[PDB]
């Protein structure tokens, strides 16, 4: 049980430096555990980045560095880029075995940024087979926290909804975020009024996207 | 044009066991150990083991005795790994990858990976997704943009493909995370955003594809 940790979350902005940092539960990270570096980019996409410590691998940006740092082994990003957000691996030899950490999700900051919101009421086709989903788009947005509150006849809703959240765009850096309402092609038929409230940093009042079913 | 693709994946029952496969080109397979690692839904990279050109040497995890087998056929350019007594903690993307070693620089790397395999261990059926337009309106716009998109409700297990028009059209898309309703059964959400006056310019199909269960579904998106 050698166990590798590395810190788990780190924001920096465009052109700053960042440090990632590796360590070991047996001892002191050394030249002899051949520290490597992974990046993971959305779509399990995979780059070899460091080796054996400090050797940048062939076509690897100047940027990325490895060195040690104290007790554990180190990524450093010198003037971080918008397309830097990422995943990061560090692994360690450990004589036979290799070992990796648990990974640091690097996000990269921007200027706030809105969502703009969407709401879909469910098709018709879905509405044939007896149940009957909302969905709620927030697009584009920055910083990631949001948010949603469903409202059916103006009721708060509560235990009938899930959301998800795509990565970091390596582009323009936002966030979006697509959550859906769940209910039974009954109760759906049993009211008007469907409503997506968002609340977010770029927002100064709550934006509500509605629909009334049948118009 | 390194190229490393695998298969072998899908649905397995508990207990049982499962053959990957993972053919190469584009590189002098003889000479390079190969290496294999795994990734759990959520969860962080696991290495599983690794071999030498010649077979003589193969490095695992510490494991239980013959959990993974690795072996290798060079005739072939082909890398494989046997999995035996699965259980749901088996559940994962199986990554093929070539190991760049170097003994003079002291370098040992994992520079080029395959995309993945996926194995799910469960007993659960097998279902295919139900593919449901989400309808744009020239009335509903956002910031400039209108929105449409595809859910894909209800299907197990993981993954779903989808693309648009094809793999046409690219910009301005989101395929979202799947989440796992308390009904046992996943749910996803692929969006496409365009400039409102865009609208009525283009075709929009949503393509989605469910291995497992041999689903293949063309959705046209109509404004509505």
């Known amino acids: 049980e050698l166990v590798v940790t590395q810190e788990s979350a780190l924001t920096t902005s465009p052109g700053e430096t960042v440090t990632l940092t590796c360590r070991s539960s047996?001892?002191?990270?050394?030249?002899?555990?051949?520290a490597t570096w992974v990046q993971e980019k959305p779509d399990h996409l995979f780059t070899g980045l460091i080796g054996?410590?400090?050797k940048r691998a062939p076509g690897v940006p100047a940027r990325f560095s490895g060195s040690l740092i104290g007790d554990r082994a180190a990524l450093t990003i010198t003037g971080a880029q918008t397309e830097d957000e990422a995943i990061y691996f560090c692994?360690?030899?450990?004589?036979?075995?290799?070992?990796f950490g648990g990974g640091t999700k690097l996000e990269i900051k921007r200027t706030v940024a809105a969502p703009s919101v969407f709401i879909f009421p469910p098709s018709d086709e879905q509405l044939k087979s007896g149940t009957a989903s909302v969905v709620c788009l927030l697009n584009n947005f920055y910083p990631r926290e949001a948010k949603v509150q469903w409202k059916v006849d103006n009721a708060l809703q509560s235990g009938n909804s899930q959301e998800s959240v795509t990565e970091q765009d390596s582009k323009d850096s936002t966030y979006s975020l697509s959550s859906t309402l769940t209910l039974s092609k009954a109760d759906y038929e049993k009211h008007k009024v469907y409503a997506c409230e968002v609340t977010h940093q770029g927002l100064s009042s709550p934006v509500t996207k509605s629909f009334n079913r049948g118009e | 044009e390194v190229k490393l693709l695998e298969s072998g994946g899908g649905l397995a029952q508990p207990g049982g066991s499962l053959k990957l496969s993972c053919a190469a080109s584009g590189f002098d397979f003889r000479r390079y150990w190969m290496t294999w690692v795994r990734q759990a839904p959520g969860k962080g990279l696991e290495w599983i083991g690794e071999?030498?050109?010649?077979?003589?040497?193969?490095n695992y995890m510490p494991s239980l005795k013959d959990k993974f087998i690795i072996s290798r056929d060079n005739a072939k350019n082909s890398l494989y790994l046997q999995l035996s007594r699965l259980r749901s903690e088996d559940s994962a993307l199986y990554y093929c990858?070539?190991?760049?070693?170097?003994?003079?620089?002291?370098?040992?790397?994992?520079?080029?990976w395959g995309q993945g395999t996926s194995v799910t261990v469960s007993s659960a059926s097998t279902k295919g997704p139900s593919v449901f337009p989400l309808a744009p309106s020239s009335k509903s716009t956002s910031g400039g943009t209108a929105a449409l998109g595809c859910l894909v409700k209800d299907y197990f297990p993981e993954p779903v493909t989808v693309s648009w028009n094809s793999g046409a059209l690219t910009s301005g898309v989101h395929t979202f995370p799947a989440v796992l309703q308390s009904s046992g059964l996943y749910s996803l959400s692929s969006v496409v955003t365009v400039p409102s006056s865009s609208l009525g310019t283009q075709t929009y199909i949503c393509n989605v594809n469910h291995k497992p269960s041999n689903t293949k579904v063309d959705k046209k998106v109509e404004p509505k």
């Open positions: 071999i030498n050109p010649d077979s003589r040497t193969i």
């Open positions: 990858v070539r190991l760049d070693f170097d003994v003079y620089n002291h370098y040992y790397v994992l520079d080029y």
């Open positions: 047996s001892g002191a990270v050394t030249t002899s555990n051949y």
């Open positions: 054996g410590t400090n």
């Open positions: 692994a360690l030899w450990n004589s036979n075995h290799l070992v």
